Structure formats: C-alpha cells, structure tokens
Design an enzyme around this catalytic site. Structure first.
Site, PDB file in Angstrom:
ATOM      1  N   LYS A 133      20.622 -59.351  96.360  1.00 56.76           N
ATOM      2  CA  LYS A 133      19.054 -59.894  96.759  1.00 56.76           C
ATOM      3  C   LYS A 133      17.881 -58.199  97.188  1.00 56.76           C
ATOM      4  O   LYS A 133      18.263 -57.798  98.121  1.00 56.76           O
ATOM      5  CB  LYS A 133      18.505 -61.335  96.647  1.00 56.76           C
ATOM      6  CG  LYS A 133      18.981 -62.275  95.202  1.00 56.76           C
ATOM      7  CD  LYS A 133      18.940 -63.023  95.534  1.00 56.76           C
ATOM      8  CE  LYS A 133      18.537 -64.246  94.466  1.00 56.76           C
ATOM      9  NZ  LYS A 133      19.065 -65.831  94.379  1.00 56.76           N
ATOM     10  N   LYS A 155      28.129 -59.417  94.007  1.00 56.62           N
ATOM     11  CA  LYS A 155      27.351 -59.745  92.436  1.00 56.62           C
ATOM     12  C   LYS A 155      26.759 -58.822  91.897  1.00 56.62           C
ATOM     13  O   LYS A 155      25.686 -58.879  92.433  1.00 56.62           O
ATOM     14  CB  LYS A 155      27.399 -60.876  92.450  1.00 56.62           C
ATOM     15  CG  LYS A 155      26.992 -61.895  90.585  1.00 56.62           C
ATOM     16  CD  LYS A 155      25.838 -62.959  91.067  1.00 56.62           C
ATOM     17  CE  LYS A 155      25.402 -63.308  89.508  1.00 56.62           C
ATOM     18  NZ  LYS A 155      23.759 -63.571  90.493  1.00 56.62           N
ATOM     19  N   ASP A 188      23.754 -58.594  90.171  1.00 55.54           N
ATOM     20  CA  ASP A 188      23.356 -59.197  89.558  1.00 55.54           C
ATOM     21  C   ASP A 188      23.543 -59.763  87.933  1.00 55.54           C
ATOM     22  O   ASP A 188      23.191 -58.298  87.373  1.00 55.54           O
ATOM     23  CB  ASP A 188      21.706 -59.286  89.509  1.00 55.54           C
ATOM     24  CG  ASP A 188      20.919 -60.540  89.424  1.00 55.54           C
ATOM     25  OD1 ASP A 188      20.590 -61.025  90.206  1.00 55.54           O
ATOM     26  OD2 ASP A 188      19.860 -60.433  88.277  1.00 55.54           O
ATOM     27  N   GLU A 189      23.064 -60.638  87.285  1.00 55.28           N
ATOM     28  CA  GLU A 189      23.410 -61.023  85.561  1.00 55.28           C
ATOM     29  C   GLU A 189      22.296 -60.435  84.896  1.00 55.28           C
ATOM     30  O   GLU A 189      22.569 -59.508  84.136  1.00 55.28           O
ATOM     31  CB  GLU A 189      22.803 -61.736  85.126  1.00 55.28           C
ATOM     32  CG  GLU A 189      21.646 -62.819  85.966  1.00 55.28           C
ATOM     33  CD  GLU A 189      21.248 -63.473  86.747  1.00 55.28           C
ATOM     34  OE1 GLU A 189      21.589 -63.313  88.437  1.00 55.28           O
ATOM     35  OE2 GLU A 189      20.229 -64.316  86.831  1.00 55.28           O
ATOM     36  N   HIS A 216      28.622 -64.824  83.270  1.00 58.33           N
ATOM     37  CA  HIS A 216      27.575 -64.971  84.115  1.00 58.33           C
ATOM     38  C   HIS A 216      26.894 -66.103  82.310  1.00 58.33           C
ATOM     39  O   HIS A 216      26.971 -65.484  81.556  1.00 58.33           O
ATOM     40  CB  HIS A 216      26.425 -64.367  84.371  1.00 58.33           C
ATOM     41  CG  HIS A 216      25.190 -65.256  84.802  1.00 58.33           C
ATOM     42  ND1 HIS A 216      24.395 -65.559  84.122  1.00 58.33           N
ATOM     43  CD2 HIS A 216      25.490 -65.118  86.395  1.00 58.33           C
ATOM     44  CE1 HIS A 216      23.247 -65.568  84.872  1.00 58.33           C
ATOM     45  NE2 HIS A 216      24.094 -65.533  86.639  1.00 58.33           N
ATOM     46  N   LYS A 265      22.909 -83.519  93.206  1.00 59.82           N
ATOM     47  CA  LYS A 265      23.193 -83.899  92.205  1.00 59.82           C
ATOM     48  C   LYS A 265      24.271 -85.633  91.913  1.00 59.82           C
ATOM     49  O   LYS A 265      24.285 -85.291  92.801  1.00 59.82           O
ATOM     50  CB  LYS A 265      24.285 -82.712  90.763  1.00 59.82           C
ATOM     51  CG  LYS A 265      23.708 -82.004  90.600  1.00 59.82           C
ATOM     52  CD  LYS A 265      24.245 -81.516  89.006  1.00 59.82           C
ATOM     53  CE  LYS A 265      24.340 -80.487  88.008  1.00 59.82           C
ATOM     54  NZ  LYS A 265      25.963 -79.679  87.499  1.00 59.82           N
TER      55      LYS A 265
END
Ligand code: CAP
Ligand code: CAP
Ligand code: CAP
Lengths: 441, 123, 441, 308, 123, 133
Positions: free
Chosen positions: C149, C175, C177-178, C268, C308
């Site tokens: 990031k 990763k 980023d998408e 993704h 959740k």
C-alpha cells in the site's frame, strides 16, 4: 477532511463520478461521500509517494429531495489512476470495492464524466452511425431489425430459412439471438454459413444491402476471434457480441478486430438488469452505455419506450443522446449529471427492442428519429401470413411514418390515422394490425 | 525497533519461526499427526538444504524440493515414540543431516504435515 | 402450465437454478416462477423444432418464511442450451434477461447445480490446492499473503522494495493491488521486473519459495496474455487477474495459458458487490464463486469472517466448501441449496482479506483451517517497526495458532492466551499487538 | 553412446500403482528408484493426463527427481515421459516440453496412439534429440490367438520401421524353450541388420535391414532378481530389463530394491566375463553376491527358503 | 532395513556396484575382452569425474562423457598383462586420476566394454 | 474379494465394460472376472493414494448359456482414469493388457457404456446426419 474537500476545483483531466449514496443509520453524508472517495483510490506511505496527487476527492454532496437518506456525492479522480484505453481499469478503479462498504446501505453510480484527455486514448466504435449509413447506403429512415425465434432450439438450416424470409420482406438486419453461440443443436460455423447463404439471397432478390448479426460471443478470447475471422471470410457485414457476459477486455478485442477488418459490431446488453435495475444500488445504464461507446460497438440495445411514462422516456432520451452525440450538456432532468464532450468519438446507433409492434411505429419514429434500429421479434414473426409479409408489414408502416413526418404531419397525434390509411394499400399491413383495429377503431 | 537480521535466519517452512521444538513438542506434533490418521514418514538431506534452480527456471520449477526418504512411510505407526526413535536413529547416522517429518493423508492423496526435526551445526 | 411443471422429475444432466423471486403486486408465485423459466429459455415455431426439449421448467415454489413476497423458484434447464466450456454462455442463458422482467420486483440467483456432464467440459483451476502446495512445498499451515500500500501512487522500484521487505519477513505471497495494471506512475513491465528481483532476493535469503501476484488484467485479450507471457519469461510462479472487470471470456483465456505454462492464477473479486450485496436482487457470491472454479483460478477472494456473526459465518463456510470440495451436500442452513458434485475439478484455495490483524489469527486458523491464504494489508504494513518484522509478527502468530491446535488446545477459547504467550518470545509480535494488550489484557 | 552405458543390460523400473498416484508422489518414487542404480523409470503406459495427474506437472516433478538422482549417483538418468495423447497436436505439445526440460527420453504407446502419429513422434524425436521408448499396449487383442491376427514379430517390424528406440519384447520368465526361440527370432529382427530365414524361430523370410538402426528390447513383467542370470543369458547386453514389482516389491523400499537389482545384474555380468555359466551357476552366482549386499539378501529371502 | 546413503556413493557405471576389483578380477575382465576380439584402450580423468551440463542443456547433451585417451588403442594386444601394466603406469603417473578400460568392437563400430580400474583418494 | 465386488452399485459416471471371458482350465469365473478388473486398472501404495477410488470393479458374472467356459463379466471403471477427449486412453486403459493374461484363454470386449459426463468431453462427428443432409 482528507477525502471530503468542498474546496475543490475540478481539473479538466479528471474523471468525475456522481454516486447516489444511502448511508447507514448514523453516518453523516460528509463521511459517506468521503469514504466513497477514499475507497475508489488510496491509503498509506504517501511520504514515499504523495496521497494528494493520487487521491479521489469527494467535492460535493447534494440531497436527493424526495428520498430518505439518499445523497448524490460527486467524486473527482486523477487521470493518472487510469490505464489508457482500459474500461476494465476504469470500472475496477471506480466501482471495484466501494459498493460493499459496510457504512453505506446501498450505492448506485449515476454518471461519469469522461474528460477529453481520456476519451482520446479509446478507439470507440469501429465505424459509428455516419460510416455505417454510408457503407450500407441506407439514408433517411430508421433501420429495421428482426429477431429469429425461438431463442434456442432451432437448427442452422432452419435459422437461415427464417433469416432469408424475414430479410426479403424489407427489414435490413436479422439477429442471432443473444445466446445462440455454439450449442448441440446449432454449432456456430454451420449457422454462419447457412445465414451467409440466406442473406445474400435476400439481397440479390431485393436489391438492398442485408446483414445478419452473427454472434461471435464465445467462452475464450481465441474462440471469439475465430468466429469473427470466418465472418470476415464470408464477406458479411456485421457480427454481434454480448459485451457484458463476454466482458470489457474481450469486447475491446472484438472491436479492434472489427475496425481492422471492416465489420460492424452490434452489441447486446444481456445481464444489464442484474446490474442496473434497482434504483438504489448498482450502476445506471447510461454509465454501462458510455463504457460500451468507449469499448466499442456500432449498435447497442437501448430498450423500448413502448409503455413508458414521459418521465422514463426522458432518462431514455438522455442516454440515447450520450450514445449518438458529440456534446451533451448537463441536464439533470434526463439524468445527464455531467456535460460530456466526446471529442469526436463516433456514435453508437441505438436499438429499440421488445414489445414493439407495427402500430407503435409513429411513436418510435418520433421518440427516436432516424438514427436508430427498430427491432421487431414478435412483430415480424408474429404476423399470421408469415414473416416475409410481416417484414413488408413492418417496412410500409415505417416508410409511411417517415413520409408523413416529411409532409409536416404530426406523428404524436395522427399516428393511428397514418398507419390506418397505409393499411388501405397493403393487405400485409392490414392483416398485421387486425386486432388493433378492433380495440381502437 | 529492531532490524530483522538479513543473514543467518534461514527457515524451513512450518513452525520454523517458533523456538526449536523440545522432544515433548516433537512428540505432540507426531501425536496430532497420528490422531488424524496421517502416515508418518521421515525425510533427510545432507547438502542442498534449501530450494535452488539449477536445471530449469521456467514458472514453478525449483530444485531442492525433494529430499531423501529415510527408510519407509511408517504405515500403521501407533505410537509416536516409534517415529521419534527414528529421528534419533537418523541424527546419529547423519549429524550433518537436516531431518524433517512429513505425514500423508492417503485419502486426499495430499501430504498434509511438514516440520523440521533436526539441523546441522549452526542452523 | 407450459413453464410451471411441478410434475417434473429432474434429469441428472440438467442445470438447476434456485432463484429468490419477489413478484409484483398481484402476480401469483406460480406465474412468477413460470415467467422466470420462460425467459431464461424459449418461445415459438416449436412445431419446426420442439419447445419441450429446450424449455426451462419451473418445477418448485417455496415461500421464504420470513419475508414479504419472497419465494424460492427452482428452475431446470436442458444441458443442450449450454455451450460446453463457456461460463459466458451459462450466465447469458440464465441471468441474461429475467432480472429486468417487469412482473417481478427484484430477483436474486441463489444457487446453480452444475451437473457432472457439464462440469467435465471445463478445465477449472489451472492447478488447484494439492498441486499448488506441492509446487510450492508449503504444507500444514495456512499460506500468508501481504498487500502492498498505497493502492495506486507508488512507483515500480518502490513497490519492489515493499515486496522484498514483506516477503523476507515470513509471508509467502505479496499482492499487486487489484487495480495496478499499467498506469502513468508504474507501467507493468517495470513493475514485473523490479518485483521479480525483490521476490528472488527474499527467497534466496529465507530459503522458502516466494511469489508476488503480478496483475495481468489489461484492456484487451492480447495485452493481457502479453503480460502473462513476460511473467512466464521471468520464471515467476503466479500472476493475478481481476476476473469480473476482466470478464469470463478473458479469464478462461488466462486460465488456459496458466495451465499450459505452469503459473498459478490468483483471482480478485473486484466489482462483486455491485452484483452480490443486496439481498433481494442480483447473484449471490457462491454462484459467482462457482463460475470462477469453472472458469479457472487457483486462489480467489472469499472475504473475511472478522466481525461476522455466526449466521453469516455459516453462509461463508458454505461457499468456501463449494470452492475446495469435491462433493457438497445440500444444506440450506449455509445456503447450499443444491448438492454439488465437482467430479474431481481441482479446488480453489480461499483468500481471507481486509480487517485481518494479528490477534484475529486463532479465529481464522479455526474458521478456515489449513487450506487458505490469510491476507494482511494493514497488518504487515501497519506494524510500527516496518513490514519485514510485521511479516515476522504475522508469521509467528500463525505458527503458534498451528502448534497449539496440534497440541489439542482450543483456538476459540485459548486464542487470546495463545497469542499472548507467543508475544513473550517475539518483540515483533509484542510490538504488533501493543494497543490490543491495553483493551483486552 | 549418448547415455555412456556400455557392457551390461540397461535396468528399467516401473512406478506403481498404474493410475491413482499424484505428480509429486510419482516424482518421489522416481528419485528413489533411480538413485538406487536403475538407469530408467517408466511412466505407466496409461498415465497420459488425467484428473489425478495432469501431464505437465508430472513431467516437471519427474524432471526434478531424475536430475536429483543423476547428480547424486554420477550416472545419466532418464524417465520415459509418456507423450501419448488423444490428438497429434497434444502429443507433440508434450514432446516439445520434454525437449524443453532437456530430458533424454519420452515414450509413446504406438498401437493405441497409431502408426501415423508415432511416425510423427519419431520424426520429432530424431529432429530434437530425444530417445523414444515404445509400449505395446493392445497387442494381444491382435497377436494372441494362434490362428487369427498378426504375429508380434510383424507388429515389431512395423515399429522398427515406424520408429522407436526401445520396445517391449515380453519376458522369457516361465517360457518353454520352444517359445523362447520365437522370442529370440523377433528380438534379432529388432536388433540385427541381416536375419536369415529360420523357420525354427518363426523367421519365415530373410530380412535385410540395410543399415536401419536397431531397437533395444525391453523385457518386462514377472521379472525378479533371481531371474537375472537367465535374462542376462537369453537377452545378453543389448536390452533393458524392467522390474516393476522387483524394485518396488522390495521390503526395505525401492532405492535398495534398485541396489538389489543393480548388484544382481553386475554379478551376472562379472561372472559371464569370468567364463562362469549363467544357465548352471545362476542360483549360486546370485547366492554368493547376497553375501556382500544386505539389499540383495533381503531381496531374495523367500527364494532362499524354496531353493536353498 | 538400511537407508542407502545419499552421500558418498558415486558410481562409475558397469561393475561399480560390486566390491572393488582385485587384480585377478581386473585381469579376467581384460581377458574376456580379448577373448571376444575387442581392442583394449585406456582412458583417464583428473577433474570432472562425473557428467555435468555446462555448455548446453538440450535433450542428450552432457559434458564429462569424454575422458582423455591414455596412449593409444592396444591394437593386437595378446595378453591382458600388457593392459594391466598400463594401468600401473597411469596410476603412478596420475594418482589423482580416475582410470577406466574400454574395449572396441571395431566391426559393429560400438564400444562394448567399460569398467573403472583406479580411483583417487576417498573414491 | 478386492476386485470382484457383486456388492457394487454402479455410478452414473462410470465406464462399464461387458467382457466375454473364457477362463483356463481350472480358474473360476469369479477369479477371471476379478483379474480382468485388476488388470484394466491398478496394484500398490494405495496407502499413499487409495486403491478403492481408482480400482476397476468386476461387479457381475453371467454364463453365456450355450458355450463352454464363456462368461460375460461386467467391469466398472472410475471416470478419473480417463483422459477427457482421448479414445486412445480409453482403449489403452480397458483393452491394453488384459487380453494377454495367461489365466484366460480368450477374451472379447462386447460393449462399453459410455457415461454422459465422458461423452461431453468429445466432439464426435464434425457434422452428423442432420447437418450433412
Ligand atoms: O434483445 C432483444 O431484442 C430483447 O431480448 C430485448 O432486451 P433488452 O432488455 O436486453 O434491451 C427482446 O425483447 C426479445 O428477444 C424480442 O422481443 P419481441 O418479440 O417483443 O419483439
Ligand atoms: O483485496 C483485498 O485484499 C481487499 O481489497 C478485500 O476485498 P474483497 O471485498 O473484494 O474480498 C482488502 O480489504 C484491502 O485492499 C486490504 O485490507 P487490509 O489493509 O485491512 O488488511
Ligand atoms: O509394460 C510392462 O512393463 C508390463 O505392463 C508388460 O507388458 P507387455 O505385455 O505389453 O509386454 C508390466 O508387466 C507391468 O506393468 C510390470 O510387471 P512387474 O511388476 O511383474 O515387474
């Protein structure tokens, strides 16, 4: 605060988004709008880069005076976030993660303003309205299309029989159903061949140029271009693609191939209502229409106005103009949230489909005018004497709505009379609207 | 704030970032293994202790992944002591060895456990 | 009636759909369910073909006891409607026009049962869990991923610095980023090259195999495979694709390329919540997850269970099992409306992302177990001493949740204590959860 | 020449079970067997690409095991990667990736594959440097009944002409001297340039091969360590002796089952060179070599019980 | 059950898995050779004792296969003692050498015998 | 026994073979039929995989009432043995080694039932009767 900047003066090379946002239960518009902006852009060592250069800015909140918690937030995104020419990366950067953000309840994308310095990175239509009319030699009247039915089920020789019959009657286009791709009952190459035979027969007979949208949608990029390549090979004028199930990546590939090989692209909006129906979550169709003008297609399904109220009819005409026009001014009435300059990208001819019948001809000739394809499924087909005279039925109906308009007659009023006096010199058209005589006349 | 040493911290995948396991710890892992029904087996290596790519560099080829099987898969091992006895065998047999215990889940035909059991001097 | 046939006995080569349908204002379930079936299949000269062979049949109505007008209609579709191997044609035939049908108010697709004679026409994962573990030599512990990031903004040399740092600390994957595709601030080939350099450095250092998901999503099919081809060329193990903005056609092409060239595919789910969030209209994620196991990917984003409720957590575990397992029995509790036989198609390893922090380790190690990738963005990065020790932080946390589970300790209860006693022998992990000590201990 | 293997039959090993095993597993089997002393390990005639082991993964994991074995032993290793496929295209695709990992031999099932396709795989191997090992799967649908069909020496002749470097010749283990002679008739048709008509061993016609290269024969199935002197004497040096259950069936595991099988054979060779007679001294040869190899000892412990 | 050592058992192909040959054994092999009519020749090597692939990795290329010819092929050798004399020459000449005896079958133009005759320390 | 399982309930994704088998001279149908099944499928470290998942099962013996030693054995083979789209691998896995098995005298393959989940992996006719016409 960092992502809510009412201060902001938008740059001409900025992509603006008008998102209708409905916050939770105790979240001020100001935080909603700023979370939307944060999440369709950035977060951390912006002392190694700069947050401010790449940050999405929520620069405006309106309240939709009518609903509950609805606001219209205006977000501004840097042109440097976007990969030139990739609608795939426009949508991944704007609509890729904000709609599932827990602090909003529902979120809908209403409009995008696409700045001229990003419109120029895209090819857009492989040909567009003016060229298509030219190529085909069709001028001064909407183009007429016809649906072959049933959807699935029919065989290739049969489909071609249907196609010849319909085309020699006067329509200019016949359509591979959105989901005939290649199946156990009709494999693609046989279909393409039998329809290339029916369409040249029709053309030789009429003297007018014919086309059949051969659907090149396929499960891989490779199989899709393979189909396109054989339509190129039979010298036929148009292939079709289902851009939303196919995908944006693949349709930019089929659109580049059509540009490079001379074929018109007809697009079908299959799956749009999974995305654009609910009025409080999703993406409005004019944003999906805009992404097809940029990804590329020459025809796209715009819906129907048959049985639509004048309020609906106006959002429809807002996005039909976004599809055909070079400059569309902001007109929140018809949902045009942003002015859009298309810097000469060609326009997409709109297709009016489903429920259309012969007696709806004057309304569609007046609501859509000449630059459109009017598509009869059940019109052509549903005619009782068969579909070549159902094609004549539909062709004299329309050439009378045009003659009349040219003579100054008013289609909104004289409609039912126009068609009525043309039924007098066409048993085809007579037969076509016999029940409608019973209710109306 | 410490800098994590760039040298001398070569790992051997699963559990190799906790402190070195005590024999009661070793044992409990071999017991877990058995408690789920997985076949123990021992593997060992004397020279390439870590992945390398000598013979090909295409996506996914690495050399060093296979190690030498120490004796056989202990089909129907019932007490983890049998396994542990073996590690003590291999260490005296091979003090330059890297020794590891693996466990097969024959039914899903995956290997499903791995952790090192002994290392050479200064590892 | 013609499309509502409660008579019907479903064939083993039939695709069944469980659609949650909410009719209008005076439309009986029986007509709703039958319109759904009519419209995802057929209509006319079925005396030239046969309606009955190709018709979709609404063979069941349930009422969702809880809501208003909600029903669950079960539709059955012939295997002959479907083009083998094309998820694009599965979705165009089922979800292509019914969701905009005016007689329903909202419609949601809850499950699809994909019969073994259609599962065998698809490749599915280019490699799947068992092979991936094998290829990578990683066994007995969830695989750890790390997000680099900010999203946009960073440069290629910088991204690679981030990647090396994070990977040498103990994560196994980092990763793209998408939405880093290729942009003015980081063009793809430079990124790919600098990250291939950082990832081999990390691997040489640790001794464990490393990977970085190089994002090959592109605006055309061609540019996408071009990127894949150069990752193949540097010998790197995994590329990534945004399957929903990319599209199903294109991802089946990238999945075939990965199969044929040895590369893992990480997927993704960008844009899913435009499709799957509202509970009354759209497509449920387990149907989008199923279409990725069939289109092909080796990893896919499953969401998080952090924060959740146990009711949510159970629909999540319903579709995680649909992704990893060969046989999943119908269990309307966790939303598994149909039993699914996968006839050996490989399983997709699930990725748990967003909000995950070190102290959530025992819950995720127990809710997901060993076959998953646990993905820390803000975990790795947000650590105050930097991201290589934030990687150590996250790696000892997890190897203690595993050791403990193997020793019989219970992660649901002893969780906070497990991590607590491991903080005692890792300043890294200590530093990592210092505020959490303050609230909890 | 290519392989640097001279003066002793080449030893092969079968990986078992036939179907069922995974790629990483197959490669573990392969490394173990090869470092023990066999020179070749074999993709089963029907592992092509299936739900449990897709080809490219197999090829990659076995290229890794075979280079490991070679690096360890110092002798050149090979694994027959089976390139049989359902289309001509998929077959050459597999061949091409074996070429790409630099591995020495691929394999093909010439009779289910077909003659057209195998002439294509044989031309590719010639042009790219790979040895071709052939498997005679389906032959007995064609060559078993003694009154209808095609005799195997005619199917063997059509493989020397279509092209392969190794072919499955059967076994002589448990074959009568009359059988053993038709077997040696067609082994000679496979290796030799001129074979005179000899209706005794079924050679109905003299055959001149005008220098076409000879196919090395593979003796498979039922072969065990104690059969070593008979096969070293019936087939001699130009053959591959293929142990499935020999390598594998050894109780200490298959690397020492490979040592078991390798010392057995290097003793049947030494002895032959010293003039000893393998037909007679066989059981004694192997017996005195068991004295200096626990591997070989363990390998024939039940046979001690019946025989000695 | 023993584990076959993964290290230190590098072989030199034919007969290198039997015990090291006695000179009477060496002799009998050289006699066999001669008894079939095969030309003896000696080959030796001081540095790459085992196959490697330095210069190419395509199917079937290996480096290390050729060794240096020690003197000439002993055309018309009649007693194996001549050959053995030579191995004793090369060993004193070259104690770091690996020495091997090969035998040509000129007629079938194949090399048809091979076995090592001497090794350096700790081989 | 391991390969003769009259117990067996055939899966819809199974390839069934009806082999006419003539055993030797003192080999019961039950062993013939089970050798046929063993040999068109598997054998060993099925504790590293699973024998039972990939084993061919002889699940029926009929006697051809007419001939000597003729039986009809019904063997069932897992769909996971078969490479999708390769008739070459169907025939190599079924008829590749059993017809030369010494304990049978002659063996003939009479029929194969090809399950729909394997028929769909094949293209079949490039065009077929209806298109050709
Ligand atoms: O594509 C079409 O042409 C539609 O599917 C419109 O779809 P959109 O929602 O995607 O725009 C059609 O309504 C029918 O197939 C023809 O209707 P009819 O027989 O009444 O003329
Ligand atoms: O893809 C991811 O990894 C997500 O975008 C999850 O998306 P889905 O809704 O599409 O599954 C991440 O939350 C953030 O980028 C990292 O979060 P964090 O910094 O909290 O760890
Ligand atoms: O190909 C082989 O190697 C055979 O199939 C021989 O076939 P042919 O009839 O086609 O020549 C083998 O017998 C077994 O797989 C190994 O036997 P074992 O375990 O006894 O050593």
């Amino acid at each position: 605060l960092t992502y809510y900047t009412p201060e902001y003066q938008t740059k001409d090379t900025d992509i603006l988004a008008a998102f209708r946002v409905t916050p939770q239960p105790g979240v001020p518009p100001e935080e909603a709008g700023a979370a939307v902006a944060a999440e369709s852009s950035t977060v951390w060592t912006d002392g190694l880069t700069s947050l401010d250069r790449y940050k999405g800015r929520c620069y405006r909140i309106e309240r939709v005076v009518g609903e509950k918690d609805q606001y219209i937030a205006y977000v501004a995104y840097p042109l440097d976030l976007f990969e030139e020419g990739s609608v795939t990366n426009m949508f991944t950067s704007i609509v890729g993660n904000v709609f599932g953000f827990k602090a909003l309840r529902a979120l809908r994308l209403e409009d995008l303003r696409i700045p001229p310095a990003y419109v120029k990175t895209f090819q857009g239509p492989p040909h567009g309205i003016q060229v298509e009319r030219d190529k085909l030699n069709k001028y001064g009247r909407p183009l007429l299309g016809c649906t072959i039915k049933p959807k699935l089920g029919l065989s290739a020789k049969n489909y071609g029989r249907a196609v010849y019959e319909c085309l020699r009657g006067g329509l200019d286009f016949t359509k591979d159903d959105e989901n005939v791709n290649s199946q156990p009952f009709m494999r693609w190459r046989d279909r393409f061949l039998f329809c290339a035979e029916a369409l040249y027969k029709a053309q030789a007979e009429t003297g007018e140029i014919k086309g059949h949208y051969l659907n090149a949608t396929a499960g891989t990029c490779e199989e899709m271009i393979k189909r396109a390549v054989f339509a190129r090979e039979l010298g036929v004028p148009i292939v079709m693609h289902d851009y939303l199930t196919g995908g944006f990546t693949a349709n930019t590939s089929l659109a580049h191939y059509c540009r490079d090989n001379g074929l018109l692209l007809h697009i079908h909006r299959a799956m749009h209502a999974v995305i654009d129906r609910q009025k409080n979550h999703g993406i409005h169709f004019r944003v999906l229409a805009k992404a097809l003008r940029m990804s590329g297609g020459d025809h796209i399904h715009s819906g129907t106005v048959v049985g639509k109220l004048e309020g609906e009819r106006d959002i429809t005409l807002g996005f039909v103009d976004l599809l055909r026009d070079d400059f569309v001014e902001q007109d929140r009435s018809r949902g045009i949230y942003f002015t859009q300059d298309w810097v000469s990208l060609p326009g997409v001819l709109p297709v009016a489909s489903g429920g259309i019948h012969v007696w709806h001809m004057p309304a569609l000739t007046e609501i859509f005018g000449d630059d459109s394809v009017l598509q009869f499924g059940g019109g052509t087909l549903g005619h009782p004497w068969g579909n070549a005279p159902g094609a004549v039925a539909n062709r004299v109906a329309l050439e009378a709505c045009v003659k009349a308009r040219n003579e100054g007659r008013d289609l909104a009023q004289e409609g039912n009379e126009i068609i009525r006096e043309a039924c007098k010199w066409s048993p085809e058209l007579a037969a076509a609207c016999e029940v409608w005589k019973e209710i109306v006349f | 704030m410490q800098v994590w040493p760039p040298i001398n911290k070569k790992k051997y995948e699963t559990l190799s970032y906790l402190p070195d396991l005590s024999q009661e710890q070793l044992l409990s892992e071999v017991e877990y293994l058995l408690k789920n029904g997985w076949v123990p087996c021992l593997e060992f290596e004397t020279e390439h202790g870590f992945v390398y790519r000598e013979n090909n560099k295409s996506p996914g080829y690495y050399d060093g992944r296979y190690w030498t099987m120490w004796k056989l898969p202990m089909f129907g091992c019932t007490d983890a002591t049998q396994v542990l006895a073996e590690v003590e065998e291999a260490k005296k047999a091979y003090p330059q060895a890297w020794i590891r215990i693996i466990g097969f889940d024959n039914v899903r035909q995956v290997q499903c456990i791995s952790f090192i059991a002994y290392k050479p001097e200064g590892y």
